[PDB]
Amino acid sequence: KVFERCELARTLKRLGMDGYRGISLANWMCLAKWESGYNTRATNYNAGDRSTDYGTFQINSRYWCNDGKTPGAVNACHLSCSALLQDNIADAVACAKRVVRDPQGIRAWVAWRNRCQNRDVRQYVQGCGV
CATH code of the domain in which 105 resides: 1.10.530.10
- Listed in sequence order, the DSSP H helices in the chain are 5-14, 25-36, 90-99, 110-115
Q: Residues of 59-92 as b/e, b for ≥16 C-beta within 10 angstroms?
A: bbbbbbbbbeebeebebbbebebebbbeeebebb
Which member of 53, 87, 102, 120 is catalytic?
53
State which residues form the domain around 70. 1-130
Shortest CA distance to 51 belongs to which of 61, 43, 41? 61
Shortest CA distance to 12 belongs to which of 36, 42, 38? 38
Distance CA 22, CA 31 (A): 15
Judge whether 35 counts as a catalytic residue: yes
User: What is the arrangement of strands in the sheet containing 51-54, beginning at the earlier edge strand?
Assistant: 43-46, 51-54, 59-60
Distance CA 63, CA 86 (A): 19
Judge whether 18 counts as a catalytic residue: no
How many domains are contained in the chain? 1
Resolution (A): 1.8
Q: Where are the beta strands (DSSP E) in the chain?
A: 43-46, 51-54, 59-60
Cα–Cα distances in angstroms (integers) from residue 124 to residues 46, 72, 81, 99, 109, in the given order = 28, 36, 27, 22, 17
Cβ-based neighbours of 44, under 8 Å, separated by 6 or more: 52, 53, 58
Shortest CA distance to 28 belongs to which of 62, 4, 56? 56
Cα–Cα distances in angstroms (integers) from residue 103 to residues 70, 71, 99, 100, in the given order = 23, 23, 9, 8
Which member of 7, 18, 35, 49 is catalytic?
35
Q: DSSP 3-state helix, strand, coil percentages of the chain (rounded to 5)? A: 40, 10, 50
